């Protein structure tokens, strides 16, 4: 498709998603992954913690401030995984990463946009229901976030707000349906021509 993408990270699989993101970043499409705390990983909680802590020990001995940067926020963690699936030594790879953009929680502009979901990276689909897991949120915490608590309380504040809109939008649809029935004999030979070639049945 065209235009800016917004993907809602919750319920996705950390790398399975990131491969799909990274393909479309390289095709010039602007992606914005949101809510990366929610993003989740196969294998049990600890497994991947233990696997992260393995990362943290990897560190340039003779000076570490050069050595690998083990970013702690889920946004950043995922970025990393996307980035490893780009050719980021090269100009198109860095130009690619710039087309990506990644947040923890869901911010201004992106609260206020409908937003999509990659079923082929989606956990309920890709995984078996009898298998264990981490949320990159909790993983990120036990590795050195400072901001699981904050991005909780803000998202609760956003959810409460978004619910108002959902309910007002719910109330307009109830008006649409009641107003179809309150005018169904001066649109009763247009609605006809809709339902004849499929539209609206």
């Amino acid at each position: 498709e065209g235009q800016v993408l917004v993907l809602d990270g919750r319920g996705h699989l950390l790398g399975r998603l990131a491969a799909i993101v990274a393909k479309q970043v390289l095709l010039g499409r602007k992606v914005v992954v949101v809510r990366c705390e929610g993003i989740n990983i196969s294998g049990n909680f600890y497994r991947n913690k233990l696997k992260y802590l393995a990362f943290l020990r990897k560190r340039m001995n003779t000076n570490p401030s050069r050595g690998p940067y083990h970013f702690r926020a889920p946004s950043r963690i995922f970025w990393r995984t996307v980035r490893g699936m780009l050719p980021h030594k090269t100009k198109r790879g860095q130009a690619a990463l710039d087309r990506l953009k990644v947040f923890d929680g869901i911010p201004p502009p992106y609260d206020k946009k409908k937003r999509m979901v990659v079923p082929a990276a989606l956990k309920v689909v890709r995984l078996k229901p009898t298998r264990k897991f981490a949320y990159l949120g909790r993983l990120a915490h036990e590795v050195g976030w400072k901001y699981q608590a904050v991005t909780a309380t803000l998202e609760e504040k956003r959810k409460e707000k978004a619910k108002i809109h959902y309910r007002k939008k719910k109330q307009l649809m109830r008006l649409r349906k009641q107003a179809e029935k309150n005018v169904e004999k001066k649109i009763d030979r247009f609605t006809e021509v809709l339902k004849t070639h499929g539209f609206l049945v």
Binding site: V193, L194, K195
Partner: protein, 138 residues
């Protein structure tokens, strides 16, 4: 809790594969992914057919569990699936997809128009309902 109990005789619509978009009586279950399947009046031979390529309907019928064509010819024929299907909500939103793909550029120009004025005659009433909802609030 489920409501569709893959019996001897759940009518199943074949989602896809060689016989896509046809109804099929599950005669009998072979295995944990394969049935012995047959769609007499929908034109589908008694053959094996997997549960992955078929979705299933609220309808049942009552041949017994290795009945032989003539007997599933009936039980389909009365009970009458091919009329009861077509009064369903499946059949009418299938046979709508159908009719969009099957739509000439002319048809589409008409709809463009027919919609527009529908969507105005619907809108002016919604505006008027909020006027009455605001005067009710007063």
């Amino acid at each position: 809790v489920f409501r569709r109990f893959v019996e001897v005789g759940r009518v199943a619509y074949v989602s896809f594969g060689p016989h896509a978009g046809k109804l099929v009586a599950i005669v009998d279950v072979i295995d944990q992914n394969r049935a012995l399947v047959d769609g007499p009046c929908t034109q589908v031979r008694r053959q094996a057919m997997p549960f992955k390529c078929m979705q299933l309907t609220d309808f049942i019928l009552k041949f017994p569990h290795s009945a032989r064509q003539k007997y599933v010819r009936k039980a389909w024929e009365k009970a009458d699936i091919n009329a009861k299907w077509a009064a369903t909500r499946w059949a009418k939103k299938i046979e709508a997809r159908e009719k969009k793909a099957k739509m000439t550029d002319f048809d589409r120009y008409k709809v463009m128009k027919a919609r527009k004025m529908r969507n105005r005659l619907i809108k002016l009433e919604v505006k008027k309902l909020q006027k009455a909802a605001l005067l009710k609030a007063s």
